[PDB]
Design an enzyme around this catalytic site. Structure first.
Site, mmCIF file in Angstrom:
data_model
loop_
_atom_site.group_PDB
_atom_site.id
_atom_site.type_symbol
_atom_site.label_atom_id
_atom_site.label_comp_id
_atom_site.label_asym_id
_atom_site.label_seq_id
_atom_site.Cartn_x
_atom_site.Cartn_y
_atom_site.Cartn_z
ATOM 1 N N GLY A 17 0.923 -1.163 0.011
ATOM 2 C CA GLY A 17 -0.071 0.009 0.035
ATOM 3 C C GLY A 17 0.924 1.159 -0.139
ATOM 4 O O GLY A 17 0.234 2.286 0.207
ATOM 5 N N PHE A 18 2.056 1.207 -0.016
ATOM 6 C CA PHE A 18 3.222 2.050 -0.375
ATOM 7 C C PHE A 18 3.728 2.216 -1.616
ATOM 8 O O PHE A 18 3.845 3.565 -2.089
ATOM 9 C CB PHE A 18 4.456 2.022 0.760
ATOM 10 C CG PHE A 18 4.651 0.647 1.228
ATOM 11 C CD1 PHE A 18 4.375 -0.382 0.269
ATOM 12 C CD2 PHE A 18 5.111 0.204 2.177
ATOM 13 C CE1 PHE A 18 4.697 -1.675 0.650
ATOM 14 C CE2 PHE A 18 5.286 -1.321 2.965
ATOM 15 C CZ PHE A 18 4.935 -2.040 1.650
ATOM 16 N N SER A 20 5.055 0.123 -5.562
ATOM 17 C CA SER A 20 5.446 -1.039 -6.098
ATOM 18 C C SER A 20 7.019 -0.961 -7.063
ATOM 19 O O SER A 20 7.100 0.121 -7.444
ATOM 20 C CB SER A 20 4.687 -1.605 -7.617
ATOM 21 O OG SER A 20 3.217 -1.041 -7.151
ATOM 22 N N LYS A 36 10.685 2.530 -7.923
ATOM 23 C CA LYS A 36 9.720 2.683 -7.315
ATOM 24 C C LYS A 36 8.458 3.555 -7.931
ATOM 25 O O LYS A 36 8.754 4.590 -8.116
ATOM 26 C CB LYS A 36 9.843 3.301 -5.718
ATOM 27 C CG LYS A 36 8.513 3.044 -5.068
ATOM 28 C CD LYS A 36 8.642 3.591 -3.422
ATOM 29 C CE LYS A 36 7.512 3.427 -2.701
ATOM 30 N NZ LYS A 36 7.647 4.060 -1.139
ATOM 31 N N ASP A 136 8.510 4.950 10.666
ATOM 32 C CA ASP A 136 8.033 3.359 10.238
ATOM 33 C C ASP A 136 9.122 2.437 10.355
ATOM 34 O O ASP A 136 9.508 1.674 9.717
ATOM 35 C CB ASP A 136 7.231 3.205 9.012
ATOM 36 C CG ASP A 136 6.580 2.212 8.960
ATOM 37 O OD1 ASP A 136 6.167 1.414 9.784
ATOM 38 O OD2 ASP A 136 6.256 1.643 7.775
HETATM 39 N N1 LIG Z 1 15.219 -6.803 0.009
HETATM 40 C C1 LIG Z 1 14.190 -6.209 -0.500
HETATM 41 C C2 LIG Z 1 12.793 -5.633 -0.633
HETATM 42 C C3 LIG Z 1 12.284 -4.655 0.364
HETATM 43 C C4 LIG Z 1 11.134 -4.215 0.167
HETATM 44 C C5 LIG Z 1 10.537 -4.111 -1.112
HETATM 45 C C6 LIG Z 1 9.281 -3.328 -1.349
HETATM 46 C C7 LIG Z 1 9.284 -1.943 -1.166
HETATM 47 C C8 LIG Z 1 8.148 -1.385 -0.911
HETATM 48 C C9 LIG Z 1 8.099 0.086 -0.391
HETATM 49 O O1 LIG Z 1 7.090 0.729 -0.062
HETATM 50 N N2 LIG Z 1 9.432 0.697 -0.552
HETATM 51 N N3 LIG Z 1 9.662 2.058 -0.391
HETATM 52 C C10 LIG Z 1 10.675 2.207 -0.730
HETATM 53 C C11 LIG Z 1 11.298 0.909 -1.238
HETATM 54 C C12 LIG Z 1 12.876 0.685 -1.268
HETATM 55 O O2 LIG Z 1 13.856 1.446 -1.429
HETATM 56 N N4 LIG Z 1 13.050 -0.390 -1.591
HETATM 57 C C13 LIG Z 1 14.255 -1.090 -2.107
HETATM 58 C C14 LIG Z 1 15.508 -0.308 -2.522
HETATM 59 C C15 LIG Z 1 16.626 -1.010 -2.855
HETATM 60 C C16 LIG Z 1 16.701 -2.470 -2.897
HETATM 61 F F1 LIG Z 1 17.776 -2.852 -3.251
HETATM 62 C C17 LIG Z 1 15.550 -3.219 -2.495
HETATM 63 C C18 LIG Z 1 14.508 -2.497 -2.016
HETATM 64 C C19 LIG Z 1 10.485 0.096 -0.951
HETATM 65 N N5 LIG Z 1 10.554 -1.236 -1.228
HETATM 66 C C20 LIG Z 1 11.138 -4.932 -2.097
HETATM 67 C C21 LIG Z 1 12.383 -5.594 -1.874
#
Ligand SMILES: N#Cc1ccc(Cc2cc(O)n3ncc(C(=O)Nc4ccc(F)cc4)c3n2)cc1
Length: 277
Positions: A17-18, A20, A36, A136
């Site tokens: 919900g944040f 994709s 994202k 969070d």
């Molecule tokens: N593992 C994992 C990993 C952790 C979270 C996600 C989903 C997610 C959902 C979300 O609302 N947000 N908001 C910011 C990020 C984010 O920066 N994710 C991210 C960045 C670099 C990376 F290498 C992996 C994920 C994020 N990720 C996907 C893979």
């Protein structure tokens, strides 16, 4: 210049919900990135860039924390589309979120927990120094750069500008929310942050969070289900003080006896992460 020409888009990584998030590569140098997408219709918090641009508050906060300190995942670039915003974030490889890491390994050895918790504290301090409140903090919002042993904060989707007055809104994770929010719908940024860090530390050394229901949070009795040292129990209980004014400052946490002699990130990786067991 269009998003599609600067980056090669890959498969989904995650969402919610944040937003994709997709795997990506920056075409110019093959830098791994995370892409994202946020729907304009799902955005509730809007901010202003210093040049007076209406953007999601998330972008405002990301920009403020995105100078080179490596304890946060940095925003490399962003794009506006007709019905969405697209964020280009760095992507360490290999990488794993702390939630999965704990799940895999169970409760962390205290030496590892110490290293990880220390880095989270340094990352949160960085955010506050940049005028940003995350709101969070939890294992799902922390990434591990496995090769470097460095932790990185993600997901400022519930964040706010840091202020010294009362917050009367909260959209973060409830089981990480402090008693004052549960009871009064009011909290101050730093002391609520310390509460969430107490929950995080417990989760690190016990493999699960301490509270499930509102009445447990409000009661504030901490039961330990795993063997945890007296100094670690003390710090946890201190962070989880019912009254915000009874909680330690970040200085007090980092000067706590349990926190002394932390490993460096590379040491941490060598000892704990570069292994099959
Ligand atoms: N593992 C994992 C990993 C952790 C979270 C996600 C989903 C997610 C959902 C979300 O609302 N947000 N908001 C910011 C990020 C984010 O920066 N994710 C991210 C960045 C670099 C990376 F290498 C992996 C994920 C994020 N990720 C996907 C893979």
């Amino acid at each position: 210049e269009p998003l599609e020409s600067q980056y090669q888009v890959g498969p989904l990584l995650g969402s919610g919900g944040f937003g994709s998030v997709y795997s990506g590569i920056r075409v110019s140098d093959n830098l791994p990135v995370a892409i994202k997408h946020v729907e304009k219709d799902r955005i509730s918090d809007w901010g202003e860039l210093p040049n007076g641009t209406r953007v999601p508050m998330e972008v405002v906060l990301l920009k403020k924390v995105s100078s080179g300190f490596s304890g946060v995942i940095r925003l490399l670039d962003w794009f506006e589309r007709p019905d969405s915003f697209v964020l280009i974030l760095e992507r360490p490889e290999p990488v794993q979120d702390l939630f999965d890491f704990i799940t895999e390994r169970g409760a962390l050895q205290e030496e590892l927990a110490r290293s990880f918790f220390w880095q989270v504290l340094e990352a949160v301090r960085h955010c506050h120094n940049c005028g940003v409140l995350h709101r969070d903090i939890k294992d799902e919002n922390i990434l591990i750069d496995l090769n470097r042993g460095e932790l990185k904060l993600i997901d400022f989707g519930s964040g706010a500008l840091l202020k010294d007055t009362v917050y009367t809104d909260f959209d973060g994770t409830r089981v990480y929310s402090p008693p004052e929010w549960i009871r009064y719908h009011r909290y101050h940024g730093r002391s609520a942050a310390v509460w969430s860090l107490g929950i995080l530390l417990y989760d690190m050394v016990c493999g699960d969070i301490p509270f499930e229901h509102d009445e447990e949070i409000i009661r504030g009795q901490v039961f330990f289900r795993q063997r945890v040292s007296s100094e670690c129990q003390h710090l946890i209980r201190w962070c989880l003080a019912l009254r915000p004014s009874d909680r330690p400052t970040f200085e007090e946490i980092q000067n706590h006896p349990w926190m002394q002699d932390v490993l460096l990130p590379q040491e941490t990786a060598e000892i704990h992460l570069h292994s099959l067991s």
